[PDB]
Design a protein around this nucleic acid. Structure first.
Lengths: 267, 264
DNA sequence: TTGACATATGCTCACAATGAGAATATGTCTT
DNA sequence: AAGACATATTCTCATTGTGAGCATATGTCAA
């Protein structure tokens, strides 16, 4: 199977392309007529979303974890375009820390603390996985550890896809391991924007300084330092001035910027 | 569906890779119904083709062929059949300076870019970012992209171009392409957080770890700069024992910290 | 179309902290 | 005390970090 993880940003909200009423990502089998793995997925996206597709890059290859029963191999791909879209945080509400720490995390830590305290031998162990990914025994919030966080909830039976005898589920579930595929694309994108935010596909042909920060903060799910975001784009030599002006939120002018041609030469 | 493995070891200051079929292919095996996970399935093919104990595997890249799917995995072990990394990629080892085989490669890569005037100004940008035709700086992380440029230029045995030009030892199917992905993945991990407790022994020294990182990255590193990087990343600790270095002199023995072995 | 407070933008300090390049005293043989 | 060559250990002039001002510059409900 070829599962597509296409992402767009609208009204400061990272959305993902979905099908089957947001219960599954656009996926399609790998046929004999398909030449490359990318061209074959472009066919299934065209006849299920009819949406223009930007450049794609591979994400990860997972094997099915079917407790019911031929095996299934899924190869995911990440795509960035401009905008059936469902937000990133409808399936992962605990990943948006723009407005501080969310409230659903407390219900997760309590369900994670009891799962660690269930076995005394695994107690000293499982408290370490709950401190590196989440924050049970302290630590900090690393937004890069998105995939490792979902695998812990799947292992603790705290999601609908785990099929525990107590139906404990946080976030909207998806068919099979489609929420597992979405978690890999978010962590991969978050790992790219922390050091070299090349996001000309999610933005327009020209944007401003505050608009790009609001987009990066929506992807990483963390409110960034205002002045520190200026010197990172300057040191990376990412954008340049277009020569025009616009109007910002609050009725104030700001210079318009576009991604440098050299950055579009990297892509 | 194929499961190809890229197992790497370091012996006598030379990063080797596990090979089968007389050093012409990596240990591979088709995915079947009995294998539960992709990792447990590859551990079975390695256990019978090489019988070698395997470390912890991480996924590399999934490639397509002309109908066969291949999935690569990277592994670091201590060498307990082997061929060096640079037998297939002689142009990647720059420990002794720029290899003279690069001069024969850039000349062939230049006539390929200059063959089409319209593609001239464009193709000269691939050989400058990856290689060094138009100058630039040597980036050891671009190992895979460098091999993709030789395959597209027809300068390898796997390209099957009418002028039979080949640099390095070829492999079956795209196995050298899988090895190029493992080297680029490994070299990207050691540049900032060299977690190589599997390649090293139970206890090593400062120069011994520097030689291993320089052997993997293929570049001689600064001595004092290598000291502050391992100290900042908090990777190793002292074992309380002294040793006899290359040169007959006392130097403290070091081991990877337990907290490092608790990650990944 | 026009007023005091009203909401982001460049442009600018500030130390804390890091960083490519060299330089100082400790020690391990074979002579 | 003649030297040999690698260890753990200062000093320096740079570049990225986090946290705080400083001069623009308004459209927004009233008149």
């Amino acid at each position: 199977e070829l599962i597509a993880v296409v992402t767009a940003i609208t009204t400061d909200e990272p959305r993902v392309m979905t099908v089957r009423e947001g219960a599954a990502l656009p996926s399609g089998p790998f046929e004999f007529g398909h030449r490359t793995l990318q061209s074959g997925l472009r066919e299934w996206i065209h006849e299920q979303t009819h949406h223009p597709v930007g450049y794609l890059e591979q994400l990860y290859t997972f094997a099915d974890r079917d407790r019911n029963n031929g095996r299934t191999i899924s190869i995911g791909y990440l795509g960035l375009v401009r905008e059936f879209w469902h937000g990133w945080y409808e399936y992962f509400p605990w990943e948006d820390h723009r407005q501080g720490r969310p409230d659903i995390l407390d219900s997760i830590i309590d369900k994670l603390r009891a799962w660690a305290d269930s076995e005394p031998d695994s107690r000293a162990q499982r408290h370490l996985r709950a401190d590196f990914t989440f924050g049970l025994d302290g630590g900090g919030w690393n937004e890069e550890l998105t995939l490792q966080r979902y695998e812990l909830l799947y292992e603790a039976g705290l999601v609908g896809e785990a099929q525990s005898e107590p139906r404990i589920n946080f976030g909207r579930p998806m068919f099979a391991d489609h929420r597992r595929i979405l978690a890999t694309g978010i962590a991969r994108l978050r790992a790219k924007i922390k050091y070299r935010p090349v996001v000309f596909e999610l933005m327009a042909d020209s944007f401003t300084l505050l608009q790009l920060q609001r987009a990066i903060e929506a992807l990483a799910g963390l409110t960034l330092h205002k002045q520190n975001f200026r010197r990172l784009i300057e040191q990376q030599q990412l954008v340049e001035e277009t020569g025009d002006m616009a109007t910002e939120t609050g009725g104030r002018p700001a210079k318009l910027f576009r991604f440098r041609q050299t950055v579009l030469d990297e892509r």
